[PDB]
């Protein structure tokens, strides 16, 4: 089991065996959840080709940095921004500690970088649960692979 697994196929694919299948909980309406996607809103919004997303500065600066700032400033709640790597995370949020002078988010968020420490992790989750946008799981950046995935 893995919580969800309804399309079923991947586990029998990985096993090379065909388990007995069964769904064995009563679920709740779809309406308590909402699962959005974002890409742009006018025809001039061309900076997201992602032929080299790891190198496309204009694309990082445009809806990748700018939509995050619009969504976070408008939707003022505790929100965690997951990234594919540290290097992306570092480029997207200028933060207090910037990788360059030329980076495109200015807003109070918290970091979650390597050498995470078990005690230091909790400090950031204490901050996010208590108040304000920022903390661990709050307006903070973390790579999706990293420890924040354990949760609280």
């Amino acid at each position: 089991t893995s919580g969800t697994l309804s399309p079923l196929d991947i586990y029998p694919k990985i096993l090379d065996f065909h388990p007995v299948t069964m769904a064995t909980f009563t679920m709740t309406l779809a309406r308590v959840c909402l699962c959005p996607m974002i890409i742009g809103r006018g025809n001039d919004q061309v900076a997201i080709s992602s032929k080299f997303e790891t190198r496309e500065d204009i694309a990082v600066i445009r809806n990748y940095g700018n939509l995050l700032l619009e969504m976070s400033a408008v939707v003022p709640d505790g929100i965690v921004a997951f990234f594919t790597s540290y290097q992306y995370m570092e480029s997207t949020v200028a933060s207090w500690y910037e990788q360059g002078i030329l980076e495109n988010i200015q807003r109070n968020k918290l970091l979650f970088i390597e050498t995470q420490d078990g005690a230091e992790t909790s400090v950031a989750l204490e901050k996010y649960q208590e108040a304000c946008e920022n903390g661990r799981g709050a307006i903070l950046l973390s790579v999706a692979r990293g420890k924040v995935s354990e949760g609280i």
Partner: protein
């Protein structure tokens, strides 16, 4: 079934042998076959509705432009290219937008999207040079394949867009009119296929119309702000280029920190001793001068310059006639710009007007229109109703006027004025002007009195002064 269907050319007509009996035309007009004007090819909807089709067996298979890069246009312009993908040649052919908001970019994008061997028609070499400056992102190997193609030389696959030329007909070297049978149309005389026209109103004139009429011309696009002169030829342009895909771009959709809200006004001015004697008695081209120079109207124009200079607004005053221009401007001791003012002295006056807080009013003749990087201001006064086109008043207003600071999102922050002499042929232009501007979305009003003109120093304070001008004007 059309798998064998011949189609040909005779002097300005297409004749169709052993036909499929296509909709919407006369039959056996003078032989068993169908015969139309070349220019009728544009009506691809009449067969498309029927479910009929055709083949270009006369084709030539050589190479074409790619221009893979893209750029970002205004929100309404992007919607306008998106529509053109939607509609296709059966239901496309002109776009209308101001001469100061991105028309060059629509032409280079319109050619880069349509992507065919293209001939670009323009009015002026300066506009070719502005296109070139726009087009540098899609230019092949930056500066080693762009060339001009007009009365002095021709070279290379591309240039200001693709090959650009001028409308002109002075002789063998004035390019598009002279060349109109050599190259241009993928279906017969089949070297190229796509036509892009900048300043499109320029072509439907009686001699010029023939450039467009004497071909089948597959794809055509036109771009303009003036669209027509006072006599409205525009029904012809639907046939000649194609139907109008867009018109609007209202300032109502771009207020809060974006362009301007303009309060438009017309000003009715009364008529002072001796000037109507003479207006009523004279039927000749001089009578235009008694209505424009009417001192009660001059005093409104002076009072209006004083009000907006007291607030340090920037003002361009338009005068349709070099006599009128100099008689107003020398009296009000404001610089003027016209034909015979040189480039050096114009660029000094215009730099002074834009950057010097002491130089806040200038006077300009017809040379702005269709072309004069006119500068920015916040106030426009026209001394007369003219005969250039109600639509050119709106192009000229739109390209010149912007919001004054602080107030960048208010109901109005820029001002347009047109001065009219009561009890003259100058009044006739108003019911059209008024209907045109309000249909273009503008707030427009009529001002009929100024009892604060009776509270300050202004010109023409006596009959004797007015008589001194009346004798000069009559001569």
């Amino acid at each position: 079934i059309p798998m064998d269907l011949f189609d040909f050319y005779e002097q300005m007509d297409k004749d169709e042998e052993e036909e499929e009996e296509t909709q919407t035309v006369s039959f056996e007009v003078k032989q068993e076959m169908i015969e139309e004007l070349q220019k009728r090819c544009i009506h691809l909807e009449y067969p498309l509705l029927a479910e009929y089709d055709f083949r270009n067996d006369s084709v030539n298979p050589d190479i074409n432009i790619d221009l893979k890069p893209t750029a970002v246009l205004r929100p309404y312009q992007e919607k306008s290219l998106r529509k053109m993908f939607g509609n296709g040649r059966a239901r496309s052919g002109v776009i209308v937008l101001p001469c100061g908001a991105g028309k060059s970019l629509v032409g280079v994008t319109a050619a880069c999207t349509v992507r065919k061997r293209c001939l670009v028609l323009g009015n002026s070499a300066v506009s070719v040079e502005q296109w070139k400056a726009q087009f540098k992102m899609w230019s092949t190997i930056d500066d080693s394949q762009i060339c001009r193609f007009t009365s002095d030389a021709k070279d290379k696959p591309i240039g200001c867009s693709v090959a650009i030329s001028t409308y002109s007909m002075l002789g063998h070297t004035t390019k598009r009119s002279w060349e109109a049978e050599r190259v241009m149309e993928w279906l017969k005389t089949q070297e190229w296929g796509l036509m892009i026209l900048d300043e499109v109103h320029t072509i439907p004139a009686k001699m010029f119309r023939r450039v467009l009429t004497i071909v089948q011309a597959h794809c055509k696009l036109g771009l303009t702000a003036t669209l027509v002169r006072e006599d409205d030829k525009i029904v012809d342009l639907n046939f000649l280029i194609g139907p109008k895909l867009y018109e609007a771009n209202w300032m109502e959709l771009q207020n809060n920190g974006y362009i301007a809200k303009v309060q438009c006004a017309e000003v009715w001015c009364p008529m002072s001793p001796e000037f109507y004697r003479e207006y009523v008695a004279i039927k000749t081209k001089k009578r235009i001068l008694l209505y424009t120079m009417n001192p009660n109207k001059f005093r409104a124009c002076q009072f209006l310059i004083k009000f907006h200079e007291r607030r340090n607004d920037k003002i361009i005053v338009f005068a349709d006639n070099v006599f009128a221009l100099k008689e107003y401007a020398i009296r009000l001791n404001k610089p003027y710009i016209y034909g015979p003012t040189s480039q050096g002295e114009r660029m000094q006056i215009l730099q002074n007007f834009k950057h010097n807080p002491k130089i806040n009013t200038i006077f300009i003749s017809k040379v702005g229109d269709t072309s004069f990087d006119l500068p920015e201001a916040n106030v426009l006064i026209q001394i007369s109703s003219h005969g250039g086109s109600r639509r050119q008043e709106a192009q000229r207003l739109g390209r010149v006027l912007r919001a004054k600071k602080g107030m960048v999102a208010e109901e109005y922050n820029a001002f347009f004025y047109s001065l009219v002499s009561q009890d003259t042929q100058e009044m006739a232009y108003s019911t059209k002007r008024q209907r045109f501007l309000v249909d273009q979305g503008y707030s427009f009003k009529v001002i009929t009195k100024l009892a604060g003109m009776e509270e300050e120093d202004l010109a023409f304070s006596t009959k004797e002064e007015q008589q001194q001008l009346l004798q000069k004007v009559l001569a």
